Amino acid sequence: SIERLGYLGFAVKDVPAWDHFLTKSVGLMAAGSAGDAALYRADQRAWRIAVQPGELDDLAYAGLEVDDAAALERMADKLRQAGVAFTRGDEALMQQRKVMGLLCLQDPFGLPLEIYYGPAEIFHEPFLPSAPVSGFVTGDQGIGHFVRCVPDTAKAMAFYTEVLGFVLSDIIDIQMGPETSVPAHFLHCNGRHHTIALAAFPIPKRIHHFMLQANTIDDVGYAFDRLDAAGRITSLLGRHTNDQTLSFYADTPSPMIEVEFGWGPRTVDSSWTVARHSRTAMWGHKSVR
Amino acid sequence: SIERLGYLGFAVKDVPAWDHFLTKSVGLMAAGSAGDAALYRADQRAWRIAVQPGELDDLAYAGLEVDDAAALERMADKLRQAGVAFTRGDEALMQQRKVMGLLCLQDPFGLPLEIYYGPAEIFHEPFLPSAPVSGFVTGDQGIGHFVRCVPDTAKAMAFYTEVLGFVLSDIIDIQMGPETSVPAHFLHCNGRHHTIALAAFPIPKRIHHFMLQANTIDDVGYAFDRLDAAGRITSLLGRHTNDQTLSFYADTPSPMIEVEFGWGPRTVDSSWTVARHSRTAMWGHKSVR
Amino acid sequence: SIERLGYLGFAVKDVPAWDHFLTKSVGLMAAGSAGDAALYRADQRAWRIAVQPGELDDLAYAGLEVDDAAALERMADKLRQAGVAFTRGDEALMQQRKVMGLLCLQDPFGLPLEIYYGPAEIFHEPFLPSAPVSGFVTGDQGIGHFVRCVPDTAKAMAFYTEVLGFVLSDIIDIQMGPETSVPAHFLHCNGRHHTIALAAFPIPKRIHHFMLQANTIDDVGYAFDRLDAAGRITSLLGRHTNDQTLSFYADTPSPMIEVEFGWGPRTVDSSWTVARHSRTAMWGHKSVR
Amino acid sequence: SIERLGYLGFAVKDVPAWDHFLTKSVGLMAAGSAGDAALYRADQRAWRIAVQPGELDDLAYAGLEVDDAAALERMADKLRQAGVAFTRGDEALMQQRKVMGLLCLQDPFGLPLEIYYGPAEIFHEPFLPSAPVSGFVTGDQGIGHFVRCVPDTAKAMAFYTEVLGFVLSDIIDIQMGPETSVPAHFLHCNGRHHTIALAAFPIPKRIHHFMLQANTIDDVGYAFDRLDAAGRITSLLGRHTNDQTLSFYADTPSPMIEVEFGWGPRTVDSSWTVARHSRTAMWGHKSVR
Amino acid sequence: SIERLGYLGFAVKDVPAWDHFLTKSVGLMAAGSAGDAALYRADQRAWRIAVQPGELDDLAYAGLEVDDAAALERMADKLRQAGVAFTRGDEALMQQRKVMGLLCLQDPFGLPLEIYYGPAEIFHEPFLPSAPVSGFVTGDQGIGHFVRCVPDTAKAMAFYTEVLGFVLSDIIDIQMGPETSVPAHFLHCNGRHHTIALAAFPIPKRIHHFMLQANTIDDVGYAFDRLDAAGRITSLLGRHTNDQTLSFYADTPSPMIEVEFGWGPRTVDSSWTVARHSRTAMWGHKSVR
Amino acid sequence: SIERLGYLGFAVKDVPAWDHFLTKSVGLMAAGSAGDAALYRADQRAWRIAVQPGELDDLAYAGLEVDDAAALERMADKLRQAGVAFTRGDEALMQQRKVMGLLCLQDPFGLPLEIYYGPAEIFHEPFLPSAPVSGFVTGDQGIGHFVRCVPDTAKAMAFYTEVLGFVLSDIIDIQMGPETSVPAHFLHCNGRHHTIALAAFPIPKRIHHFMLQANTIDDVGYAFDRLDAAGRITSLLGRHTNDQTLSFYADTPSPMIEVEFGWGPRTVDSSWTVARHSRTAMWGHKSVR
Amino acid sequence: SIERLGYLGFAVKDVPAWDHFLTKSVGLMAAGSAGDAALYRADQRAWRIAVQPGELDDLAYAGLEVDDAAALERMADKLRQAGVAFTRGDEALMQQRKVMGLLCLQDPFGLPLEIYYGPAEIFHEPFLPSAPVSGFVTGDQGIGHFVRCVPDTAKAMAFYTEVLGFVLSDIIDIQMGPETSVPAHFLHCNGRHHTIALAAFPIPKRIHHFMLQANTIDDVGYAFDRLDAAGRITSLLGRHTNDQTLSFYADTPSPMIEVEFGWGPRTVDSSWTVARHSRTAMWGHKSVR
Ligand SMILES: [Fe+3]
Ligand SMILES: [Fe+3]
Ligand SMILES: [Fe+3]
Ligand SMILES: [Fe+3]
Ligand SMILES: [Fe+3]
Ligand SMILES: [Fe+3]
Numbered sequence A, B, C, D, E, F, G: 001s002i003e004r005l006g007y008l009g010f011a012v013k014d015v016p017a018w019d020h021f022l023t024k025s026v027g028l029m030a031a032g033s034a035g036d037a038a039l040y041r042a043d044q045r046a047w048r049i050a051v052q053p054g055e056l057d058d059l060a061y062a063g064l065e066v067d068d069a070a071a072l073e074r075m076a077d078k079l080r081q082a083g084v085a086f087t088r089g090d091e092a093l094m095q096q097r098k099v100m101g102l103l104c105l106q107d108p109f110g111l112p113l114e115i116y117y118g119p120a121e122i123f124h125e126p127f128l129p130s131a132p133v134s135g136f137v138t139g140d141q142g143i144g145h146f147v148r149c150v151p152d153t154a155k156a157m158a159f160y161t162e163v164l165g166f167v168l169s170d171i172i173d174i175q176m177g178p179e180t181s182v183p184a185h186f187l188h189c190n191g192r193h194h195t196i197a198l199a200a201f202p203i204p205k206r207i208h209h210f211m212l213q214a215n216t217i218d219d220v221g222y223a224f225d226r227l228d229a230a231g232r233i234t235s236l237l238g239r240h241t242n243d244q245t246l247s248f249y250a251d252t253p254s255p256m257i258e259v260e261f262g263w264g265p266r267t268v269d270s271s272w273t274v275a276r277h278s279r280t281a282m283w284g285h286k287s288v289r
């Protein structure tokens, strides 16, 4: 039912650091502000990522997109049936988010979620990257993906698949030591191999990282050098086993939250079949202190 | 309902002969062992063919793949309704087969079948053939196909189509003498013209042969020379009438069980129409003593 | 429900004339006989057109193909419900027609129809034309089409669409004089613009003509010269308004029954929309005495 | 050296007949006049065919195009060396023809030829056909071709190949009776199989016909019906043996001069090899009284 | 011999106006400075356009590129033979221009020209436009083109074609009033229809305008709005008759010098043929006060 | 200089055997006769292979094609300079061979060669195979190739390359026993890897075999079965190391002369580089008694 | 004149280390031995890289390939004219190298060079990598490239371009410190951006490294992990500025000699233009201790 991940809002301790990070390093286009939130663009949408001041230094909310008004009412019906509490966004919130309608709720573990429809687009103000990146792969696959940390993956799974409609792509057992392994579950709601992954990681954040997909391999290669100069690289270039995303990781100005910048992943369709992997790295991705 | 044939297990009298056969001749990649079974790879799956010691010198079991956990429960519901006895594989069997879940049963005539989901893949250990073969055509069409010998084709047909969901592609009347003919039934469960064929052959084996599809015609041409040097050729190159597979046959180290190595067959789809053929050979396939 | 027109049987006064006509002129491949009927091939099917001796000098029967055994039973259920009388072909008829099963019936006006499934194919005996023609367009679209003459087009239409499942493509008002016009109805049951057309023509035959589609335009150009030398041309080259078939017409050895040899027609699909035309000729098709 | 045939001028007894013929039937666009010559367009050139009053009722002149000023001087040098008399067109003639420079001469048998360069184009006045024709194939291959009647083909051949640079494509022996045959020589100077053909025909005209190439087969089919309604058809549709032009012929208002309207011919290149044909018709082209 | 136009240097009265113009409006990337000249990029070259202070408010020089050192010596030999005065650029000039070698000269009417080879590229500093433009079409066709004003077009033509190796593409008679027309000559030295055009215009500048080619039509559409907001539009969108460039014109901060921003022109090759046009506009290009 | 191998003439002891062989088995089209020679077609040429009665039971002559009359005179000049004796074919021979001109000579070891130009084509009589073969690959590459047996390969090489213009493709050392090897030299004169190969084989024939190239792999597969039924197979299917021709060999009715029927070889071009191979078989080609 | 780099021979202190390195790490196929040299394959050539015992621990020789025997004689003529000493390889050397002919010489600074023609190929023994690599890009571009260290780049340049025929692609100034830079010259002799580069590096080896090009990016990614496990990585993944090769570097068992494993470089052609770069890295290539 949820069609794609449309936007993300972060609450951070260092807004100037995040602004420079998202523009100069990542390459997003600065798009003014909405309230005390600075807006950033990656394409034709009026905004894709919002950054506001806050002690959380974590993801503040995530916008889940449906294709129309009826679809949003159908989501409200699903929440209602599942017994999930939610509130309809008032006019002010609709204006602030620039959407035609939205339902505000939370996943089982505190992450505020906003199901919305009718987002604002500004084709008369063509996207202009702040750094050398040819463009981002969004469109029907949404803004990208993120790894949601959860204390109970089974509980999280039930909510995301059963209530929100996400579908399991595959699982990767992430070695967390000699005799410790965490089964990460990758979920899709469209062509993107996964829009949200659930993992029971021993981390104090709502998410482990968010990912943006660039158009070319050079986009990623150039990006790595930009973030290396910032001294934020956390991983060498690599390619994932399940989605085949070729990428590198880097720290955001928010401690323990990373960003993944990749290219050329595999996409999913109806014929997709669930599989299991023992490693997240097909090759590369060597961790960097 | 069954999506594709994912794996095969053989119980044989000469394991060293089978190991050399599958690697040096066929070109499969040796992939360690699981219990007393030696594993072999043809692609990204952790294993595709298993070979263990046994007096049977025949196919020990066949793995039938579904796309997810729900699908496996739906298969269990079908078996239940059809009155087909089955057992859920315990943790140890799941570990041994490297699958997330599986149901163990038998076809009407003793062939152990395992319906499973969530197989293991190892992209961090890229497939490397043991002999010059560019690659195998698997993917959604599974590992290949095999001809199941049955005492009663009508009984077998009812089980495979009605209970397992296979669909009849076509029939070939195989001349078994001047006034003797056996109607072989070809069944598909995906794009592969046929994944399983049923034939009432006067042979003491569970199957007449199994087939692997290579990527190029040269793969087959080279393979024929490799198996000819082993003195195992049972047929000259040829092309089948129904699936248009261009191939040759050869003996495996297990008496009366052959292998077919082919290329470029026709694939099936929704618009497929059942037809009848009087010969299995479009051309070639001359039998070789 | 009927999938395509698979074969035609003619009962004629001059078999040697028809044999020469179909082979030397049309280019079909002579394929032996079945009973007192001479068989002719246009592709991989064991036969497509049968010609037997008879005073009728008309179409004796038409084979309507379905994709499988279940589909044939579903047709039997439709006939039953519609109150249409039919008989299951006995073993001998199945053998004679080389089909796995068939129902024998008649359209509202006497044309014997045979709904069948599982036709015989002989890929080991590759099609070889008897005259220079590169090949025929058959496959899923069947053998071609024919215009069925009927005394009551509304009655015929109800039977073919409501009972057999054909779908109206379009209508062409065929000027039959200064103040006389006959509305020809074109029906499809697959990709071929039309497999059967109904027209209330003042002709003593069951059909006005049958059509075969060649692979290239040169096939048609060469064919016209072949039939012109036979002195059988009834129309100059032309292109139809509705299906866009580029063709010419010629007399068969059976008085008042013609053959149409064409190329490159338009095909239909789900999005097709019913339309009306005042002429059958987009250009050409000038009638020739 | 001559690059392509760029234009033709006719001197005719019935200008109104020729105007209607070229526009309503052929489909050329009326483009005003130059002196007492009515101009017609087939593409971006200011004019392609000119028609002026005259008792000749034949081709008055032909424009042979070179790519630049230097090239024209090189042609003048060739004529000079070959001893061929010619005159440089004065300013008035350059203006009348709308060319930057031109040499006026005659072939060995009286046909006035004008070698020119720098023709006028009017892209701001897009070509608009006077009849339903999708467009003409001109460009680098020039306006089309024509068959030049000559009393001595060997003498004509020497001049056109040796002096003007045309190259022999092939020869077709045109049966002119039981024991009479005329060897027609086809010459090219670019991609068009032939731009000029020489034949010793017993006809009182400078040319037997001129040819225009349309973009689609329907263009030709529609054109045939248009000229048939005018009662000018001289040949049924057909396809030539040497250039593979699919076309039909028709009479122009000038007695004994025809027009050929075709499509899809074969083109020539460096690897072309001279061949001989016994017929001009691959198929069709049946002569019509 | 000259391979393409590689760079342009302007001497202007308002550098800050030119900097804003080239970046914010045109979209070029600011690339530091060289001496008192501000550098701008359009691709991988270290610089493409230089702007320095000066009363000229005109083009200061133009860089003509050859492919190697030998080629530059061959140009020196040509100048020498033609009696054209030139000087070899010293080390300092080579450093300032970032080229491996260069000859400094002037065209017959005072425009300083620099023939060079071995330009500097900086792929490690990816091009980043200063305004929304997807990219520019440069590569082998050079930076673009410009219209050189000359008092004597015949004298200019002799120098550019005979000494520098440019080739005439075509001519357009530009109506300069009721009975006044100026024949503009378009010259190419590569795939670009024209790199330099000569016209005897009554203007006090060395050039009438310079042109840049963008990758998409939207690039041009967006650019027009950007320059319209600057109030610099001199022409509405249009398409040229000869090169088929779809573009609009605008004033640069230098009085009487314009810029042309276009897309999708036709390219030239060996088979190109010289032609003449009476208008520069195929459509559009309406002049704007 | 020689452009391609255009035709072959055989002198044989059993003409009826050769006629059946070439038509029923190979698939060539019977094309009447010329003198006491029966003609056979493979495409649009009036004939490609001629068979006449004779005790030789070998190749009687080979036609080497040039593109025009001038080219033939240039060949005559080459023969003259090389001191090679030759005679111009009289009118009768030109008529018999259906060529516009030809020079008759012999290679250094007795094989009569005819260099010709202007061959006859009959597009009005479309090629119709006598057996199921989709078509042959001829065109610019000629009819195919043949292996010429010579007592002195160096002497043969000098003549074919130096006098006739053939170019060495590569060499294959053909093992003729434990310590015996024959270096076969492959020569091309166009795109066909080789048109003529020279080998010092201990065989009493002028040639070891001739080769024809079919359009599809099935053409070859079907052909093998046809020749196997004739009991003429001399080799199993295989693929050559140098030209990559996939084929099989068979005996012609002429003792010690074979035919090769293949598909999909590699073609040569200017960038081709001479190489050496130790085997003729990439795979297959197992000799059959 | 030299067509491509065909092979390399190394003289090393640790042959077992080199054997494991080239097979297990790089992925080359072990191909027996020739004398005391172990041979390795990368494609259809009998060998591409040879490794023999020696204190040099450097490149022992390089094979430069020409297309034929005449071409080799033309090279001998060039050496002769240039006054370069050389010796014709005797039969034994020809046998050892498996070439049809070769000239032995040295570049100006001691690197033994062997110009050869007619190399041996073994298509009957299909290439089989020793490690997971899909294949190498060789063919007309040869085996790859290498950086030749020279004390005098101008002297080296004169020899390689003037005597051997290599052509300068571009130059990269390699920063060798704060005020130290070495101008590396890249030379091509075919489509490969460069086959040999000259640089005045302060290194005691004949070459700095040799490069092999793989078919896919994953080939490189997998290769990096293989060499990292060997602890031989000297550089992180990166992409070069001039040839756009995406690669990583690693140490060979020979101290101070590295290997480069890359993918997807740009290729050169006639239109190539010499340029200059200040960095070798477009991105990545961070040096690793
Ligand atoms: Fe991720
Ligand atoms: Fe099989
Ligand atoms: Fe019809
Ligand atoms: Fe014509
Ligand atoms: Fe312009
Ligand atoms: Fe051969």
Ligand SMILES: [Fe+3]
Residues within 6 Å of the ligand: G145, G210, G211, G260
């Ligand atoms: Fe390198």
